[PDB]
Design a protein around this nucleic acid. Sequence first.
DNA 1: CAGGATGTATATATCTGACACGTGCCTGGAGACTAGGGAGTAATCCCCTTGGCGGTTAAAACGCGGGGGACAGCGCGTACGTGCGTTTAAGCGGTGCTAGAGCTGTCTACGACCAATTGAGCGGCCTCGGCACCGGGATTCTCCAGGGCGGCCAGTAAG
DNA 2: TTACTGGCCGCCCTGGAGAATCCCGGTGCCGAGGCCGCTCAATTGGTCGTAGACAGCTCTAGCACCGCTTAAACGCACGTACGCGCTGTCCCCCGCGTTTTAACCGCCAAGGGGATTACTCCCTAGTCTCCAGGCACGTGTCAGATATATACATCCTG
Lengths: 82, 80, 121, 100, 89, 112
Amino acid sequence: VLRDNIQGITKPAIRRLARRGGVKRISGLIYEETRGVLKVFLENVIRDAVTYTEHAKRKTVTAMDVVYALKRQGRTLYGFGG
Amino acid sequence: LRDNIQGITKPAIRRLARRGGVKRISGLIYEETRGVLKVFLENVIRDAVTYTEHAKRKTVTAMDVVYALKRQGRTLYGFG
Amino acid sequence: ARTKQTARKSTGGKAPRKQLATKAPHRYRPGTVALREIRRYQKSTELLIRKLPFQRLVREIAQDFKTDLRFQSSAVMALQEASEAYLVALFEDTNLAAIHAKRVTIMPKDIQLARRIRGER
Amino acid sequence: VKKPHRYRPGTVALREIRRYQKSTELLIRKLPFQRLVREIAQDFKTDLRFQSSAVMALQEASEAYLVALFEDTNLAAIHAKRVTIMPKDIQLARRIRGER
Amino acid sequence: SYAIYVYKVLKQVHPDTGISSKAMSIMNSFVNDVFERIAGEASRLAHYNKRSTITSREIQTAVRLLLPGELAKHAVSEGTKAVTKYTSA
Amino acid sequence: RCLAFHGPLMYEAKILKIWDPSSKMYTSIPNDATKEIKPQKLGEDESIPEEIINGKCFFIHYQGWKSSWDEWVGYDRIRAYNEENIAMKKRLANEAKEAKKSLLEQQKKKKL
DNA sequence: CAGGATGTATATATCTGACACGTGCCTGGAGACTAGGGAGTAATCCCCTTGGCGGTTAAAACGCGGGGGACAGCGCGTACGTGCGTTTAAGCGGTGCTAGAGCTGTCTACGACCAATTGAGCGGCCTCGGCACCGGGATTCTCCAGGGCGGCCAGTAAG
DNA sequence: TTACTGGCCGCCCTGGAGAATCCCGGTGCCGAGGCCGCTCAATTGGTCGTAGACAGCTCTAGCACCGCTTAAACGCACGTACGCGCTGTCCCCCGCGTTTTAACCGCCAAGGGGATTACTCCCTAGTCTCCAGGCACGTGTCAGATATATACATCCTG
């Protein structure tokens, strides 16, 4: 069983993204707030990802599955599996 | 029909945004909204015509515009 | 020196020349009526854009895509009820952007941002 | 007296903005991510096993979603004429998109 | 024309309320859209899994992707009743 | 540890080496596994201020300042690290706090 | 606080055009019966995730100053909304006209289907050059202490 | 009396002092790609069955125009709320050392489950035949639109 992993996304790893995004100064509350968003985005993709995995009765979530769950929501992905 | 986008009036936009929820509308909107609405129709029509131009028809019927709107993501209901 | 020009060469202006070139108390404070105008509209569903000026707007757009089109009187509606909604959504998003910027009056900055953030640019 | 030659507040970030946009590697640290995904899926169906790439495919999309968020919350923070982004923008830039 | 079918439902859930001739149009245009989304997703779902035929299990999984939250719970609770009732006779 | 009286107030420092100046050859903990202290001859390029050199001498590294920036001290500047010696720094630090504010009164008088 | 004026909401009554029901009809769906092709069911095996081990160092956490932006306050002046008066042309209702939407019938060209044939594109092996990496100078970037420069009064030259 | 230059304060760009970054010269490393069987899917040659291409025709629905009422637009006046620019204040986040930590790498393994075949079976497509539910059209009460005329509701504004 796993617990308290969301705080594993290190506070710098939030800015290291945000740099690539193109922001200069980051307030104090963003860090605790962004995890709240990313967690919402996974419970969407992962779920849709799991459902296919359950469907074909295969235990392991195939890399090809995640490309589908993304393709349904609207964020297509290129290069992984195909 | 040289200029018809000037036909969508100032009270026309003002009435719309009033439904939208705004309170005070700055003067430069009344012109700038026309720029948006125009570039919206140029996309919806240019698709509706293509469905028409394919079926060999010469009339853009509602069953076309509903289709052209659907790809836009703006699905429309009530016509077919 | 640089001299522009004269566009037209006659003193009469061709108005007198045939085959013309040119002749062939109580007041509400500001804002109080605005809100009254909203609840009078957000409660109603009637079409806001005037119809016969829209009909002539759709025809003008169709020309440069194909000539001699004929629109079913239904397919001019189905455009209007779409392009009215598109705008009402856009205006809600701009109102949000302005409430954000801490002013009340939407402005083209707000329009352009509410479109850029949507990614529908 | 005693000056350590500290760069001006603001020019390290721009510098490292110029350093990340140019680069392309993964930013969110790999393993502490994987232990997150395994923890999320552990909720929806217990005792799953994740193929290696299927974890990578997520992180590759989870990054390029946030980066798409910050590049769009920034436009909201520039909008109020300030520089520092703030949670009252990520609350906006997600409702404008309608994704909520 | 799903309209006769829609009326039969409305007259069940509300024995007194009526429906305007434009709502039917909304619903006839609505049911068709949901049916297309589901059956369209169902077709793509069988293709990923190399299966040739759409079956009872394909539609159920196709629902839980589209319908959000509570709807997914009761819809699939409704669907299973129909198949079991049909298979009963 | 050590503390270095730099002008008005001292700062936090760390003993980089321990040297007997009569020997004129210093013993330092090298940088990195633990690097055992080595007795090395005093560097000719290395300059020693007399206060450090009369009694037992030692080069220091300041905390917070970079090694390249880091420099020498006298021994009168060095009192053995003590919470009481930290307090006097803070009293001077507090005395340095309004020192910028006391100067700003002339700027307050300059603006007004 | 007190009170008129206003706008929307509320009631009663009057039509209608419109949705609900009736009835006839014919076209899609239900019954009935296969057939083989898809789907489930059993070993198996191997390769590929999960899991543990230890060094190690790249990186995360933590600490502190202070530098600069967040934010609050304020002065304001103009681009707004509001109201009136005039004035568009939008909407309604007709008359007229006709391209052209929709539907029929005929039947030819086109695509599904199949057997035999063959070479295109597949997996697997193997290699050596494009490139990641590191090192140390050379070069650029940035920050900041010292430094020429109009704006004033003081005493200037004087009608 | 008037008059106004000079002096001192006012205050930049510019060299340097670093840090960061680029250049280039090696130095291995592994996958891009070239080559080799081969097999199985594309190709070829033929038939058959019909989808639609094509031609003709029946009526709809659209276009054009137009004359009238009147509601919506438009322009002008005005007065004031707000966008905005300025100042001031302070807190909080960036910058940069230190100090702790756990990602990473590489390494070994074990057994688990996804990927083959064999087999066998049973389920839906295909087909034929009969009929009644859904559709279209007709109509006929009727709930909603519409006109008109109270009952509070908020809005200012003293």
